[PDB]
Assembly symmetry: C2
Homo-oligomer: 138 residues x 2
């Protein structure tokens, strides 16, 4: 009920997820959020099981839902998979960049809801779509 | 006529840029592209000079232009600044993630033009955003 939203950052490669999270954490002075890197030799199912296992452990601290921030590929499917398996409300967002991790952790750490965080992140993506749109014009 | 577009990945953190670049290079079997990890202690001007310094030592290898893939605000001015200073055509994409680096590196390595790469990445980025937030 007063749990902060749980933020998990999952990305392809050796240290993208963890390095992006470290950046946000150092900018905000917080240690909340969890990063997991999927190196190229690791099967997608193996990664899901890493995430699911930690989620299951911390179930009682994840009363206000989970936000999965991913880059690409199969990883977004984990959001619905976790909800189906654990019943914990999950939103998943692809194409995650440093700013998005930063904004997710900042809002999570001050107790904003999963829905409020998801909406603000959508607005950030929309701002960028528009900035890019305007740049393509010239 | 033959230069590949030079792709530069500039990200905040210990290994964000280099990790994304390595993922792309390994997935694609190519060694092209430059990553520059910017630590939080580094000044904006130092970051800029790091980029500019490499660029101007390899001008002819960049004569088909430069694509900067960046994350955060301060880096977002570097494209126009680099172009103004060097005259080498530069495009820049913010909110860079793994798939942005992947497709930029894939296109550059097969000899796609700057305008084409930039166009296609922006179109893909918008498509995925719209599908993500659809329902």
């Amino acid at each position: 009920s007063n749990a902060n939203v749980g933020v998990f950052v999952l990305m392809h490669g050796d240290s993208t997820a963890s390095s992006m999270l470290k950046t946000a954490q150092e900018l905000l002075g917080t240690s909340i959020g969890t990063a997991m890197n999927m190196p190229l030799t690791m099967e997608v199912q193996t990664m899901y099981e890493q995430l699911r296992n930690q989620v299951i452990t911390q179930k009682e601290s994840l009363n206000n839902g989970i936000l999965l921030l991913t880059d690409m590929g199969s990883l977004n499917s984990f959001g619905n998979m976790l909800f189906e398996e654990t019943g914990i409300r999950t939103k998943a967002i692809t194409m995650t960049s440093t700013m998005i991790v930063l904004e997710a952790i900042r809002m999570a750490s001050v107790g904003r809801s999963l829905e409020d965080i998801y909406q603000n992140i959508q607005l950030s993506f929309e701002s960028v779509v528009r900035e890019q749109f305007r740049s393509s014009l010239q």
